[PDB]
């Protein structure tokens, strides 16, 4: 199935701007992003732990 | 704010900051203790800055007042993004004076073609990224509910309604979230969502807030 962890970060339409956190397969990282603050898809983490612990080696 | 102009110091006294270590999204305070944002802002530990200018540079009319309460409404959808508003009330009263004040609520619903004043510390850009220090403003019409739901079949409710332009340009942005879209002295709007910022034939969309007014004094009265 579709890794997750491998989708671009998604902002989406809602205009806040809260620093989240994505993991970043070329990067091979968990890197930050501007998350609007909804409709968020799940490579969307709220701290760098939650999102190594999730796709950490993706 | 994309293709707005420098508000200048305070000239927006009813605007505050939502921080979380962070701006994050703005807020319009009602009275002495309440704020108006967006439910899709509402975050864990929120501090109320009010009388700012300089996001980034303590000037000396700041009010750092952490939220006490942060009421979402009852019926907020997440997925339609229905209902996209959110009460908080500030821990302790904020001085009121000229540089920090209140905004009257809508006693009746704006019209299409009424121009409104939009302000935040959002991006500055449609495409890239770009964060102010000193607030931003933007004056826009707001537009028929015909022309928004063309521009977003399917996806306009009766609590919501566009503002902008067409043409692109011109619009609120990430970061703007929560923040006012003020007609004639009175807020009728709250900063929302939208597809990206300023693009062309895709105006802002803004939480209807005459619609909520009932609410809004009931809610803020039994807490
Ligand atoms: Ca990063
Ligand atoms: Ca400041
Ligand atoms: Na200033």
């Given at each position: ?58 | ?72 409404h009852?019926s ?6 229905n209902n996209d508003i ?19 609520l809508p006693?009746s619903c704006a ?46 409710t009766s609590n919501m309604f ?26 009728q709007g709250i ?15 803004y939480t209807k807030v005459c619609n909520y007014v009932s609410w809004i ?7």
């Open positions: 199935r579709p890794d997750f962890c491998l989708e671009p970060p998604y902002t989406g339409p809602c205009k806040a701007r809260i620093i989240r956190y994505f993991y970043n397969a070329k990067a091979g990282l968990c890197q930050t992003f501007v998350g609007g603050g909804c409709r968020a898809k799940r490579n969307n983490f709220k701290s760098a732990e939650d999102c190594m612990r999730t796709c950490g080696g993706a | 704010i994309v293709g707005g102009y420098t508000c200048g110091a305070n000239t927006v006294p009813y605007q505050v900051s939502l921080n979380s270590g962070y701006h994050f999204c703005g807020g319009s305070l009602i009275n002495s203790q309440w704020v108006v944002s967006a439910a899709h802002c509402y975050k864990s530990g929120i501090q109320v800055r009010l009388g700012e200018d300089n996001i980034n540079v303590v000037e000396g009319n700041e009010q750092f007042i952490s939220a006490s309460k942060s009421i979402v009852p907020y959808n997440s997925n339609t993004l959110m009460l908080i009330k500030l821990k302790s009263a904020a001085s009121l004076x000229s540089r920090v004040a209140s905004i009257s006693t019209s299409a073609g009424t121009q409104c004043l939009i302000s935040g510390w959002g991006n500055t850009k449609s495409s890239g990224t770009s964060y102010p220090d000193v607030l931003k403003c933007l004056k826009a019409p707001i537009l028929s509910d015909s022309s928004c739901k063309s521009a977003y079949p399917g996806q306009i566009c503002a902008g332009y067409l043409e692109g340009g011109k619009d609120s942005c990430q970061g703007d979230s929560g923040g006012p879209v003020v007609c004639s002295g009175k807020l900063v929302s969502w939208g597809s990206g910022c300023a693009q062309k034939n895709k105006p802002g969309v004094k009931q809610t803020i009265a039994s807490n």
